[PDB]
Every structure is written in structure tokens, then in C-alpha cells.
């Protein structure tokens, strides 16, 4: 039985190229989570109540999406490597921007999960491929729900009367199609 | 065993500046009460029933922290003073316009618990800082609670509808950031 | 009523000096989260489940330590502004050691908010001292686990029976004196 | 509507290249079941009741895969063809190194599988790559569980007082990192 790079037992090697994808990965959804972290504060500070407990959600759950990155790897024996994680933006000019920004940020994480699946395809991990498909399956949903939420704002096209109504939405949990 | 101006066992003498001080601060706690009363009776006229509702209950929970401070004073066994209340500003042209007054009002009373904790720290009168900590703390959240509030209600730039909106979450008891 | 930076309504300003002091112990909070993670990894890698759930836990709830404190900011009407994290430290010899600078990164914590609480009340900002006072006193609770934790680990003295045993304790949820 | 090998009706023909792979793949994992019975037995005679629970339940859970490949053969209207199994190991100088038998084991499983797959994709036989995704992710779950369960008792270093922590353990239940 022969030791994995972080010291375990070692049931399949993984090449470096695609360690270092993951460990970047883990650093893209780590940047996600600080990034509705951001936005979260800003809508507090317009008395977005709903908009911030939504967003305060995602952070969380971001992380938590993270750290399932860093728990495959301890599984493939493989060293982690938490990298510097650069400051999220933290200004938008309307609630609408800030939307379009945060839609921005799921579809770059999905192509972020893409890119990883992409080079295991080209190594033959299974594990990974398999590991990942959940992952892009939530991608979808989280896609589809943050097309959906910014939609609905930019159908309220300003209006603040729109924005209160979609605002206590959030707050109720309606944050999706249904 | 010494007795205190009210007659009372005296566990430690309070200096008449700081002992004024309290008793002028009751004074504004007393008139902030019947100022949210004032402003509940505004709303009222206007139908806007959830802001009626929430001012009636703010009159009677300022009441409440104004005797809790005659509380401390007799377990102090200092003698209270309950003083001449002024009339309250009855008249406003917007909500907005009311609740910036209110938020003056909720700032302005934690101003005075200021005031008096700084004479208590000059006096080196630990009962009272340690007294005044947990209001200053009520403070911070309602001071947070009333900049929601005004800023929610500033957000809707005098629009009805979204004032009517905001009412029905005060009525509901959606009353902070959450 | 005057805006405060943020844009909410102000209830009294704050000195940039101890803005800029919240900020960055807010980046101390969000290291120290970083940095248990990385613990908890370390002790994954080498099948001290205990202590992985023990750390894993750490690492949330410092972070939403640090989320407390943007609340804070948001309450006082100031900006936040999320800073760049560096890395976390990924290696260690022992045990021992890392429980080492666990409990150092707790004391450091600590003395973090006291050089806060120290600027306000150099500049009389009493919402700010009464706001870290339970902050203190969960850090005492935290640095008497830490050191009970860590002393624990020094009484095992590196025998693997010991660190199981205590790894077990971990799991159990059983982490302080009691 | 034609008829598959085994004589009920066929949705899409197999190749017989993967038909032999899947088919020695369940010998494989009759086999994996035959050496953790083995196991078992060996812990058994050296009264490490708990190791002898878990690779009891591992034997069953194993001939549990194995059965479900069958069963997806009959739903391919495919032949099975149950083929002679071979003696397993039975004789080990320790526990350590028995369990780094089991890690090897669960590994080879997987590169089993992996080989199934391959040649799945390679003859665009997408039931078959469909059918196998969950049974990759289990055995990702299981070699996780594997270098968890062997890394423990290498840190153990052959101490009898430690490999009895570790086997009241595993008799708990307590058989990952949770
Ligand atoms: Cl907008
Ligand atoms: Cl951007
Ligand atoms: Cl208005
Ligand atoms: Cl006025
Ligand atoms: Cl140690
Ligand atoms: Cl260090
Ligand atoms: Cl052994
Ligand atoms: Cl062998
Ligand atoms: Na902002
Ligand atoms: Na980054
Ligand atoms: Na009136
Ligand atoms: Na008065
Ligand atoms: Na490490
Ligand atoms: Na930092
Ligand atoms: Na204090
Ligand atoms: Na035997
Ligand atoms: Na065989």
C-alpha cells in the first residue's frame, strides 16, 4: 500500500494538473461565499432585509460547498492547499447590478466545476467525474434561481414599491420558481 | 448601617451630580414615551394602522425602561423625582418626516444614557456603569431597528403603495432587519 | 438627521481611527476561521475524527463571529470593508504543536478586541465597549477551553493511546473542563 | 422486439467484451465478500470483536454489490454467468497488516469498476456508465473509510492497549471520520 501526497493511504494517484484545478476551485467557492458575504452587507445597509438574509444563506452555504471540496480531497489522500483569498467587491449602483453580478458569479463557479470535469475526463478519474456530478446538478438549480431572482428585479425596473414586494419575498424563503 | 435619602439602608452614597443626572434621564425616557404616543396617534389618523400599532407599543416599552430606572434608584436607596413632562411634538407633514423625529428621539435617548454613564465613570460608581450597560446595548438595536425603519420608509419615496406595504409588515411585527 | 458613511441614518459618529480597528480585527476573526479549517484538515489527514469535528465547528463559528461584528458596523451606520485573507498556516509537527498555536490564535483573538475596546474608550465610544463586553467574555471561556484542550494533549505526551483516547473525548462533544 | 441472451425481451444489445467485464467484476466483488469474511474470522480469533462486527457486516454489504450487478445484468436482458470463487487470504501477521489487505482490497474494487467503465464509454453504452456513477461514489466513500480505519490503527504502532480503544470503537459503530 503506498502513501498519497497528505499522508493516507493512496487508493488511485491523482495528476498534479488536476490537484491544483480542485485546490483553485476550492479557492473560486471560497471567493463566492465572501462575495455574497459582500453583497449581503450591502443590502443590509438599504434596509434590503430579505435580500440580506438570502445572501447571508449563500455565504454560508458557499463555504460549506467549499469545504466539501476539501473533504475529497483528504478522501483522494491528496494535500490541500488553502490559498489567499482575495477582498469581494463591495459596490454596486442598484440592487439590479448587484444582481447581475451575483448570476455572474454562479455561472463563473459552474464553469470553474466545468473546467475541473473537463481535465479529469482527460485523466480518467471516474472518482472525480462522479464526486463532481452532484455538484454541477445543484449548479443548475442554483442557476436557474438566480436567473429567476434577477429577472423578477429587473422586472420591477427600479420601482421601490417592486423591489419592498420581491424584498419580503426573500425574507419568506420564496427565493425560486417553485 | 447608614440610611439613604430615601430612607432605606444605604450600601454605598451617590453623588448628587450623578443622582440628578438619573433623574433627568428618567425624565427623557418619560418623554420619549409619550412622544411615540404622540406619533402613534399621527399614524392613526392616517389609517396607517401597523405604524399605529408599533408606536403604541414603543410608548409602553420606553414607560417601562423609565421605571426600571426608578427602580435603580430606589434599589440605590436614592430618592426619585419624577418631574414636569413637557407636551410632545404632535404635528409632522410625511411619515418620513415622523420617523426621522423618531430616530432623533431613540438617539437622543441614548445621548443621555451617555451623559450619565460618563459621571458615573467620573465618579468611579461601578453599580451604575454595570447598571447602564445592558440599556446601552437595547439602545444599539433600537437604534439599528429605527434607522431600518426610516430607511425603509425613505426608500418608498412617498409612494402610498409602498407605504401601504410597509405598514402590513409592521402590523405583522416586521419591524427590524431580522 | 445626518447619513452615516454607509448610508444609513447616523446615530453618532464614529472616529475613522476605530472604524479602521474594527475592520481589521474583522479580518483577525475570518483568519482565525481559516486557519481552524486548516486545523481541522491536519487533523483529518491523519484520522483524528475528533478533533476534525471539533476544528470543522471552530471554524464556522469564528466566522460568524466575524459576521457579528459586520452586523455591528452596519448598526452604527459604517462601511465595511472586507480585506484580503492570507493564507492559513498548513503544517505542523505534532499535535501538540498545533494545539499550540490554536490556543495562541485564541489569546491573539483576544487581544485584538482589546486593543479595540481600548481605542473606544480612549475616544468615549461607550455602544462599542458594551457591544465587545460579551465578546470578551466568550474569549475567556474560549482561551480556559483552549488551554484545557492543549494541556490535555501536553499530559498524552505524544503516547497514541492517549491522543485516541482524547480524539474520542472530542467526538463526544466533551471539549472543556465542565 | 427481439430477445435479449438471456431470454427475456432487449432494449439495446451488449457487447460481449463489457458482458465478460461486468461478469467477472461480480466475481470480484464475491470475492471482496469471501476475504472479508476471512477477516472477520481472523479478529475473531484473536477476540477483536469489534474489527470481527465490522468485516462480518462488510462480507454481507459486499455480496449486497455484488447481487445488485446481477440484477442489472437481468435487467439488460443480459446472461449471468456465477463463476468459480477462489480461496481467499486467511492468514495475516497483524492487524495492521490485515487491514492494509482490506485497504488494497476496496482500492482494487474500484479500479475494477473503473474498468468496467471505460470500456462502457468506449462502446457508448451510457446505461452501464449510468448504472456504475452511484457505485463509484460508494467506493469513494469506502476507501475514504478504509485508509480512516487502516490509518488509525498504524498510529496505534502495534500497542495492544490502543487497538482495544480502536476496537471497542469499530464494535460502537464508530467506523469513519464522520
Ligand atoms: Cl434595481
Ligand atoms: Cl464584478
Ligand atoms: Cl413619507
Ligand atoms: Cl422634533
Ligand atoms: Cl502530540
Ligand atoms: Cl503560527
Ligand atoms: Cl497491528
Ligand atoms: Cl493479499
Ligand atoms: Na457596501
Ligand atoms: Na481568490
Ligand atoms: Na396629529
Ligand atoms: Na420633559
Ligand atoms: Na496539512
Ligand atoms: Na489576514
Ligand atoms: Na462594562
Ligand atoms: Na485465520
Ligand atoms: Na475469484
Not at 494538473?17 to 443590502?43: K, P
Request: glycine content about 4%.
Amino acid at each position: 500500500v503506498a502513501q498519497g501526497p497528505n499522508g493516507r493511504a493512496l487508493a488511485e494517484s491523482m495528476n498534479p494538473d488536476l490537484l491544483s484545478a480542485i485546490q483553485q476551485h476550492i479557492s473560486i467557492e471560497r471567493y463566492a461565499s465572501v462575495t455574497y458575504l459582500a453583497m449581503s452587507i450591502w443590502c443590509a445597509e438599504r434596509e434590503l432585509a430579505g435580500f440580506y438574509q438570502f445572501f447571508d444563506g449563500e455565504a454560508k452555504d458557499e463555504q460549506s460547498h467549499a469545504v466539501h471540496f476539501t473533504q475529497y480531497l483528504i478522501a483522494r489522500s491528496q494535500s490541500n492547499d488553502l490559498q489567499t483569498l482575495d477582498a469581494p467587491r463591495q459596490n454596486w449602483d442598484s440592487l439590479a447590478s448587484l444582481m447581475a453580478t451575483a448570476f455572474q458569479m454562479e455561472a463563473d463557479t459552474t464553469s470553474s466545476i466545468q473546467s475541473v470535469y473537463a481535465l479529469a475526463e482527460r485523466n480518467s478519474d471516474t472518482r472525480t467525474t462522479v464526486f463532481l456530478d452532484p455538484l454541477i446538478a445543484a449548479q443548475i438549480q442554483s442557476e436557474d434561481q438566480f436567473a429567476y431572482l434577477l429577472g423578477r428585479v429587473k422586472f420591477a425596473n427600479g420601482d421601490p414599491t417592486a423591489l419592498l414586494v420581491i424584498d419580503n419575498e426573500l425574507r419568506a424563503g420564496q427565493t425560486q420558481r417553485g
